[PDB]
């Protein structure tokens, strides 16, 4: 992979990683452990970005075609729920504390965390760090290199898409799909140029 | 020519150009966003 | 080694052999004394030449037809300050991304001769240019005139570079003239043809 | 309000200062032809002035009994722009500079004559290390945890 043909890929990016297109011009992953931590971080930020972006765009599209009246993502938190946002935050914080500390221990030591602390009978098969599998993969799909680099690709696209959503909402004041529609309406008179 | 470039890379010349560029930048910024006391 | 010079009776600089198209031993400031600098300056002179030829044609051909009943296009000097179907800034952004792509691949070519000869989408199509500054291929040389004997290449590239110099000087001339006189270049040409004795640059400065 | 101060948009002395300033400018403006350059200059000063006062009022600044903006740096969330934010920006830029300089000094430390590249700057090297500063918190944070920051 060549992100900039033909710029020589850094020595520490030997293509032994999925998504290796030789893109690290600032040399952040010059250190091996740094490269590991950043691989994990790219996977995580990427997956959460995919989920988040999906949850931002998809409900709005279905609202446009009148399937279900769903409030936009930036106006969804405002006082509509049963348990209130504070309680929700405490719950979230607790469960995420447990889960993320767990995964963290997996990153610090791969084989250290794999079995259920309560029901020690059940366990997760020794796999790759960042790719747990086992119960996390009930449909038993093969973790091929292609599938991994596809995951990372859609992840990067979704991250950029999230930045796009944030900035676009910050400027226009409408939803991303709304902006897309207005762009379809008159492309040469509805861009970042006119909105600013 | 290489010697001239080397001279242009000497400390005082580099400093004049660098601080000249900075002065220009800060000036233009303070012309477009003047009287800034916040941010 | 044996060639006509810009300054008869002078010795050409060591770095100017004469193996380069347009070599007349002119570099009195030694701005091309270093090989890499000379090479980069060659590419820069190429793109300058071609852009200035396109430009010179672009201001002199329409202005000459505008003076006749053929066209009615406005002055080249004020063709930018007008409005179009979209704002000029949008056009400028599209220009920046497109020309940015082209100049990007060309830059990669200058810094690494081979790396940008193949089409990233369809690996079937390639460029047949041997030396940089001359891409060739089907897109940039459909008539195949780009590949020939070193003599013909020398001649053609010399013609290219010379018409380029003349064009650069011509565009600069157009700019300065429209600044001074305040009318089109054709108007100036006809005024000078009408009275070369007085209707010159001193017809306004003195 | 905070510290017994009064908001600039509600401060009388703030407004009186704007008044006296504009009136001084106009009192100077009376002597020049309206189309002349001095007139346009003084008028530019007037517009800039009132725009300044209006902007300060809009920014939510608190004024003292003097009629001047006083700053709140306690960490108060209604005034993060009065120290916290520009502080963060500063720290970012300063860290950038220092980290880049550090990179440059380390890069030439292992050479025949290091002092040379300290009196005659290696501009290609400097340009290569220039943008590395953009990610200085990330780069330094990792070097901190790694043990490549100190000896
Ligand atoms: C991905 C992380 C994330 C992002 C980008 C947002 C973004 C937003 N939240 Mg949200 N939230 C996020 C996580 C969460 N929120 C909420 C619960 C809420 C509520 C109850 C509200 C928001 C509101 C907002 C909006 C106000 C802007 C702001 O920065 O508030 C400023 C926050 C600070 C300065 C801190 C903005 C669209 C507000 C909104 O939607 O108004 C229309 C709002 O009322 N969020 C919970 C559960 C506790 C989250 C869990 O992570
Ligand atoms: C994700 C980071 C990233 C960034 C910042 C870039 C940025 C760029 N790419 Mg790259 N590219 C990337 C990922 C990236 N690409 C990936 C993942 C691939 C597939 C391996 C490519 C394959 C690619 C090709 C084939 C080309 C570029 C080119 C370019 C340049 C186009 C400039 C322009 O104005 O076009 C609008 C720009 C510097 C072009 C270039 O100018 O190369 C010198 C070009 O020809 N890119
Ligand atoms: C992954 C991140 C993520 C987060 C934090 C949210 C968060 C939310 N979603 Mg969204 N959603 C997501 C992804 C996400 N969604 C994706 C990927 C899709 C497409 C499959 C959707 C499709 C969707 C619909 C159709 C609706 C929501 C709704 C909501 C809101 C109430 C849901 C709830 O609390 O039920 C409690 C959770 C459980 C019982 C478990 C809440 C803000 C609801 C809403 O109120 O929209 C504003 C709603 O109607 N979501
Ligand atoms: C060196 C740093 C620097 C930078 C980043 C800029 C940037 C800019 N200048 Mg320039 N300017 C500079 C130095 C600089 N200037 C110097 C040293 C001079 C004196 C010759 C000028 C004289 C100048 C004039 C007369 C004008 C600009 C204008 C501009 C703006 C054009 C868009 C842009 C913000 C234009 C502008 O936008 O003015 C409002 C404009 O008309 N500049
Ligand atoms: C040493 C402490 C100190 C501090 C904290 C300040 C701070 C300030 N001065 Mg002062 N000043 C100082 C010393 C200081 N000065 C000294 C010693 C003198 C005598 C030479 C002056 C003479 C002076 C004058 C004449 C003026 C100021 C002004 C300012 C304000 C400018 C805001 C600005 O530049 O836009 C914001 C600047 C930036 C955002 C720069 C960053 C740009 C980079 C590219 C961002 C990169 C992000 C990626 C700012 C509050 C101006 C003002 O309006 O006062 C209220 C003004 O007109 N200063
Ligand atoms: C190369 C430099 C150059 C530049 C920057 C311009 C710029 C301009 N020309 Mg000019 N023109 C040029 C060279 C140039 N011209 C040359 C060499 C000729 C002789 C053929 C002309 C003949 C000409 C005429 C008759 C007219 C213009 C007009 C214009 C103006 C509007 C053009 C437009 O918006 O259509 C957009 C252009 C296109 C959609 C075509 C570009 C796509 C091509 C076909 C493929 C891509 C290029 C390819 C890689 C090579 C604009 C100021 C018009 C004008 O003066 O209006 C005020 C006008 O009526 N030009
Ligand atoms: C006017 C002087 C001039 C001369 C003598 C040349 C000569 C050459 N060019 Mg260059 N070129 C020029 C101007 C010139 N060019 C301009 C203004 C541009 C910008 C558009 C270019 C951009 C360019 C590219 C991208 C390429 C060349 C290439 C070449 C070489 C092969 C093509 C050829 O033989 O055409 C001879 C030129 C003429 C017969 C004059 C053309 C007269 C009119 C305008 C023809 C219009 C036809 C067109 C379809 C409309 C040859 C050395 C190719 C090369 O070097 O391949 C290895 C190549 O790939 N040129
Ligand atoms: C003199 C010592 C001192 C120090 C070191 C601080 C430091 C701070 N103050 Mg405090 N403040 C002080 C005196 C001080 N203050 C005094 C005397 C008053 C008047 C009573 C205040 C009134 C004040 C207010 C109203 C607020 C602060 C806030 C803050 C925090 C800025 C936000 C932040 O850190 O991000 C994130 C914050 C954290 C990561 C944790 C900070 C809070 C924990 C409990 C400590 C920072 C910790 C802000 C704050 O605490 O926001 C959360 C804030 O809203 N200050
Ligand atoms: C995780 C993420 C977003 C997650 C979003 C979520 C959970 C959204 C949740 C919600 O919407 C829903 C679901 C429903 C709403 O009701 C509620 C909210 C809460 C609003 C984005 C990451 C976003 C992350 C991004 C954009 C990262 C970009 C980084 C880049 C481009 C760095 C590039 C480089 O570092 C390299 C690669 C190499 C170096 O050498 C060179 C440089 C250039 C420095
Ligand atoms: C003059 C010029 C350069 C002159 C440089 C010279 C003599 C340097 C000479 C030396 O260095 C050497 C050789 C060797 C050294 O030892 C000695 C010196 C002496 C130091 C370049 C002009 C170069 C000029 C160029 C490239 C101009 C291109 C113009 C274009 C594209 C115009 C487009 C338009 O006009 C149209 C087409 C239609 C309009 O409506 C719209 C617009 C857009 C305005
Ligand atoms: C934006 C960077 C442009 C390239 C910098 C041009 C001068 S590069 C210059 O070259 C000299 C040798 O000739 C060296 O002695 C000197 O250290 C070096 O900085």
From Swiss-Prot, chain B:
TM ranges: 7-27
InterPro entries: PSI_PsaJ (IPR002615), PSI_PsaJ_sf (IPR036062)
Protein location: Plastid, Chloroplast thylakoid membrane
Cellular component terms (Gene Ontology): chloroplast thylakoid membrane; photosystem I
UniProt-listed GO biological process terms: photosynthesis
Entry keyword Membrane: yes
Keywords: Chloroplast, Membrane, Photosynthesis, Photosystem I, Plastid, Thylakoid, Transmembrane, Transmembrane helix
Signal peptide: none
SUPFAM superfamilies xrefs: Subunit IX of photosystem I reaction centre, PsaJ
Topology term for the membrane: Single-pass membrane protein
Family: Belongs to the PsaJ family.
Role: May help in the organization of the PsaE and PsaF subunits.
Name under which the protein is recorded: Photosystem I reaction center subunit IX
Gene this chain is encoded by: psaJ
């Amino acid at each position: 992979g060549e992100w900039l043909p033909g710029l020589a890929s850094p020595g520490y990016l030997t293509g032994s990683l999925p998504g290796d297109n030789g893109f690290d011009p600032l040399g952040l992953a010059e250190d091996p452990e740094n490269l590991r931590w950043f691989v994990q971080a790219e996977l995580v930020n990427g997956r959460w970005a995919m989920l988040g972006v999906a949850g931002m765009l998809l409900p709005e599209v279905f609202t446009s075609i009148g399937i279900i009246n769903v409030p936009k993502w930036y106006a969804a938190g405002k006082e509509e729920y049963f348990a209130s946002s504070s309680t929700l935050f405490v719950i979230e914080f607790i469960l995420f504390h447990y889960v993320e500390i767990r995964r963290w221990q997996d990153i610090k030591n791969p084989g250290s965390v794999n079995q259920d602390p309560i029901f020690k009978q059940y366990s997760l098969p020794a796999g790759e760090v960042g790719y747990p599998g086992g119960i996390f993969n009930p449909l038993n799909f093969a973790p091929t290199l292609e599938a991994k680099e596809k995951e990372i690709a859609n992840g990067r696209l979704a991250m950029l898409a999230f930045l796009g959503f944030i900035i676009q909402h910050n400027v226009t004041g409408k939803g991303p799909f709304d902006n897309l529609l207005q762009h379809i309406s008159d492309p040469w008179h509805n861009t970042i140029v006119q909105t600013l | 020519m290489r010697d001239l470039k080397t001279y242009l890379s000497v400390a005082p010349v580099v400093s004049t150009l660098w601080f000249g560029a900075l002065a220009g930048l800060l000036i233009e910024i303070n012309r477009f966003f003047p009287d800034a006391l916040i941010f | 080694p044996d060639r006509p010079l810009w300054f008869p009776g002078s010795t050409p600089p060591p770095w100017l052999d004469g193996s380069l198209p347009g070599d007349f031993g002119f570099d009195p400031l030694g701005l091309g004394s270093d090989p890499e600098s000379l090479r980069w300056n060659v590419q820069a002179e190429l793109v300058h030449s071609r852009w200035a030829m396109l430009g010179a044609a672009g201001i002199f051909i329409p202005e000459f037809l505008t003076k006749l009943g053929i066209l009615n296009t406005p002055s080249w000097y004020t063709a930018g300050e007008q409005e179009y179907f979209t704002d000029t800034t949008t056009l400028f952004i599209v220009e920046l991304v497109f020309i940015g792509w082209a100049e990007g691949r060309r830059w990669a070519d200058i810094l690494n001769p081979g790396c940008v000869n193949t089409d990233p989408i369809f690996p079937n199509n390639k460029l047949t240019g041997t030396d940089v500054g001359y891409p060739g291929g089907l897109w940039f040389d459909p008539l195949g005139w780009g590949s020939a004997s070193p003599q013909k290449l020398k001649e053609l590239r010399t013609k290219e570079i010379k018409n380029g110099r003349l064009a650069m000087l011509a565009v600069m001339g157009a700019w300065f003239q429209h600044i001074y006189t305040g009318t089109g270049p054709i108007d100036n040409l006809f005024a000078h043809l009408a009275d070369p004795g007085h209707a010159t640059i001193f017809a306004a400065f003195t | 309000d905070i510290s017994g101060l009064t908001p600039c948009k509600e401060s009388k002395q703030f407004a009186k200062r704007e008044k006296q300033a504009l009136k001084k400018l106009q009192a100077s403006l009376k002597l020049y032809a309206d189309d002349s350059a001095p007139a346009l200059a003084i008028k530019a000063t007037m517009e800039k002035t009132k725009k300044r006062f209006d902007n300060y009022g809009k920014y939510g600044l608190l004024c003292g009994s003097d009629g001047l903006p006083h700053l709140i740096v306690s960490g108060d969330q209604r005034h993060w722009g009065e120290f916290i934010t520009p502080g963060i920006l500063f720290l970012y830029i300063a860290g950038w500079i220092g980290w880049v300089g550090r990179s440059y000094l380390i890069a030439i430390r292992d050479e025949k004559k290091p002092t040379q590249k300290e009196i005659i700057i290696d501009v290609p090297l400097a340009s290569r290390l220039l943008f590395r500063g953009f990610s200085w918190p990330v780069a330094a944070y990792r070097e901190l945890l790694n043990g490549e920051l100190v000896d």
